[PDB]
Amino acid sequence: MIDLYFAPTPNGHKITLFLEEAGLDYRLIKVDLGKGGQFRPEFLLISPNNKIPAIVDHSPADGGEPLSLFESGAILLYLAEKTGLFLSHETRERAATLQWLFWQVGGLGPMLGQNHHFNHAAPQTIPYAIERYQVETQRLYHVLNKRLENSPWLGGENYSIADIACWPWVNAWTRQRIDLAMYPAVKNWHERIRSRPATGQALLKAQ
Amino acid sequence: MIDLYFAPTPNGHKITLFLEEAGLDYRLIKVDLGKGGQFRPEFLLISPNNKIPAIVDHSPADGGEPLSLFESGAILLYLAEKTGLFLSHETRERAATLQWLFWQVGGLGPMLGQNHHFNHAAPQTIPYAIERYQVETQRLYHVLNKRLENSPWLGGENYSIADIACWPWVNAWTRQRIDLAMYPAVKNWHERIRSRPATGQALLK
Ligand SMILES: N[C@@H](CCC(=O)N[C@@H](CS)C(=O)NCC(=O)O)C(=O)O
Ligand SMILES: N[C@@H](CCC(=O)N[C@@H](CS)C(=O)NCC(=O)O)C(=O)O
Ligand SMILES: N[C@@H](CCC(=O)N[C@@H](CS)C(=O)NCC(=O)O)C(=O)O
Ligand SMILES: N[C@@H](CCC(=O)N[C@@H](CS)C(=O)NCC(=O)O)C(=O)O
């Protein structure tokens, strides 16, 4: 059994996507980010960075005590290694998959997140910052598009945790002042993943 | 033989740290970020995100063609898996190590980088943005400090790629307007890593 500490956000959806694709049983535990649920002492023991997603794995491979883990990328990697699913063991595909996973964690997520912040959450309109993250958002979509023009999926011929990590952020394009049609390979890939049954199951759970 | 495409930056130093700690032979290939070396077509083939670090591994495990890789975190993980060094195979320590490695890549690096930008590189002074990333930098140091109060190293009892990923960023604490003495466990950990012989070799280049 996996407990998933969750809020309906791009980083939360990464994990529901994986769990639905892998067919793992899990319990969704809602953390109310608006009311400071992420700062509760009992939650900080699981997620000392005060963020979701976090999991608690009640059946770890070593047969021991529940295993807690935060960082969506570490969770995806952990679950992929545990299940043998959505991450290749072959060195080339595995390397390419990890490359794009870390690119999402270090680039796509953080920068699109700043885009969201300065456009929607900041109490003042700051054109320099808005422009900075807008240009960077476009750069990232351009990089993503160029890769997806060259391969069906980010890591190679198989859907993987790299695609799973990127999709919920691309799915938020509507908030990012991006025209997704300007990136046709991203658009088609986004649509393709949206049409997978597990993706629909994950979104319905978010409700 | 590993080719390392490099600039003297926190992310560049992650990989020299690893290579020196692991005792791997490598060639340093300088990419001039100031002159747009990261946009050269031949380099974009290796690093399509137009950034350093990137490596080319000329003796990959599969015996095949040179293997190119970008993202400092993927490079660390790749080299750790290849060598068996600085990443545990035991499931608990491995999970904790990966947790803090991803935390660095998604949090410490990006936010301290924004701190650097708005304080030193931006052509205008933007107090809201400076404050946002200052506060977040403080938060990240507080999280890092708390973990280091509870464990000698980020992933457990052993130095790992998680520590290696974080250190060059902490080593830039002066640029971040952070008082490292406010984070005593970070301060001691920073001093400890600085004193390791490989660290000195990496900085010396
Ligand atoms: N790098 C982290 C980012 C996680 C993250 O940003 N979580 C947000 C929700 S999407 C959060 O919990 N924010 C709470 C807060 O900042 O107080 C990951 O990939 O898991
Ligand atoms: N404390 C955050 C709250 C907002 C938040 O957590 N945003 C998430 C998206 S739900 C984010 O930007 N995560 C960045 C990432 O995933 O790396 C802020 O001020 O930006
Ligand atoms: N997430 C990336 C970040 C790498 C990065 O920010 N590289 C900088 C140097 S530290 C770079 O090459 N900048 C060139 C540019 O942005 O044009 C990683 O961990 O490797
Ligand atoms: N294009 C970058 C140029 C400066 C740069 O590459 N900064 C690196 C540090 S050398 C950075 O902040 N990387 C963020 C990370 O490592 O995630 C910018 O405008 O911020």
UniProtKB/Swiss-Prot annotation, chain A:
Glutathione binds at residue 40. The keyword Repressor does not apply. One of its GO terms (molecular function) is disulfide oxidoreductase activity. GO terms for biological process: response to oxidative stress. Glutathione 2 binds at residue 132. Disruption phenotype: Deletion of yfcG decreases the resistance of the bacteria to hydrogen peroxide. Glutathione 1 binds at residues 11, 38, 52, 71-72. SUPFAM superfamilies: GST C-terminal domain-like, Thioredoxin-like. Keywords: Oxidoreductase, Peroxidase. It holds the Pfam family GST_C. Residues 1-87 form the GST N-terminal domain. Residues 90-207 form the GST C-terminal domain. GO terms for cellular component: cytoplasm. InterPro entries: Glutathione-S-Trfase_C-like, Glutathione-S-Trfase_C_sf, Glutathione_S-Trfase_N, GST_C, Thioredoxin-like_sf. Its EC number is 1.8.4.-, 1.11.1.-. The keyword Oxidoreductase applies. The reductase activity of YfcG is unique in that no sulfhydryl groups in the protein appear to be covalently involved in the redox chemistry. NCBIfam families: PRK13972.1. Exhibits a very robust glutathione (GSH)-dependent disulfide-bond reductase activity toward the model substrate, 2-hydroxyethyl disulfide; the actual physiological substrates are not known. Also has a low GSH-dependent hydroperoxidase activity toward cumene hydroperoxide, but does not reduce H(2)O(2), tert-butyl hydroperoxide, benzyl peroxide, or lauroyl peroxide. Exhibits little or no GSH transferase activity with most typical electrophilic substrates, and has no detectable transferase activity using glutathionylspermidine (GspSH) as the nucleophilic substrate. Belongs to the GST superfamily. Nu-class GSH transferase family. Homodimer. This is Disulfide-bond oxidoreductase YfcG. The gene is yfcG.
Swiss-Prot record, chain B:
GO terms for biological process: response to oxidative stress. Residues 1-87 form the GST N-terminal domain. The keyword DNA repair does not apply. Its EC number is 1.8.4.-, 1.11.1.-. Changing residue 166 to A: No effect on disulfide-bond reductase activity. Glutathione binds at residue 40. GO terms for molecular function: disulfide oxidoreductase activity; glutathione transferase activity; peroxidase activity; protein homodimerization activity. GO terms for cellular component: cytoplasm. It is an enzyme of class 1 (oxidoreductase). Glutathione 2 binds at residue 132. PROSITE patterns: GST_CTER, GST_NTER. Keywords: Oxidoreductase, Peroxidase. Glutathione 1 binds at residues 11, 38, 52, 71-72. Residues 90-205 form the GST C-terminal domain. It comes from the Bacteria. InterPro entries: Glutathione-S-Trfase_C-like, Glutathione-S-Trfase_C_sf, Glutathione_S-Trfase_N, GST_C, Thioredoxin-like_sf. Disruption phenotype: Deletion of yfcG decreases the resistance of the bacteria to hydrogen peroxide. Pfam families: GST_C, GST_N. Exhibits a very robust glutathione (GSH)-dependent disulfide-bond reductase activity toward the model substrate, 2-hydroxyethyl disulfide; the actual physiological substrates are not known. Also has a low GSH-dependent hydroperoxidase activity toward cumene hydroperoxide, but does not reduce H(2)O(2), tert-butyl hydroperoxide, benzyl peroxide, or lauroyl peroxide. Exhibits little or no GSH transferase activity with most typical electrophilic substrates, and has no detectable transferase activity using glutathionylspermidine (GspSH) as the nucleophilic substrate. Homodimer. PANTHER family: DISULFIDE-BOND OXIDOREDUCTASE YFCG, GLUTATHIONE S-TRANSFERASE-RELATED. The reductase activity of YfcG is unique in that no sulfhydryl groups in the protein appear to be covalently involved in the redox chemistry. Glutathionylspermidine (GspSH) binds YfcG about 10 times more tightly than GSH. Moreover, GSSG binds 100 times more tightly than GSH and 10 times more tightly than the GSH analog, GSO(3-). Belongs to the GST superfamily. Nu-class GSH transferase family. NCBIfam families: PRK13972.1. This is Disulfide-bond oxidoreductase YfcG. It comes from Escherichia coli (strain K12).
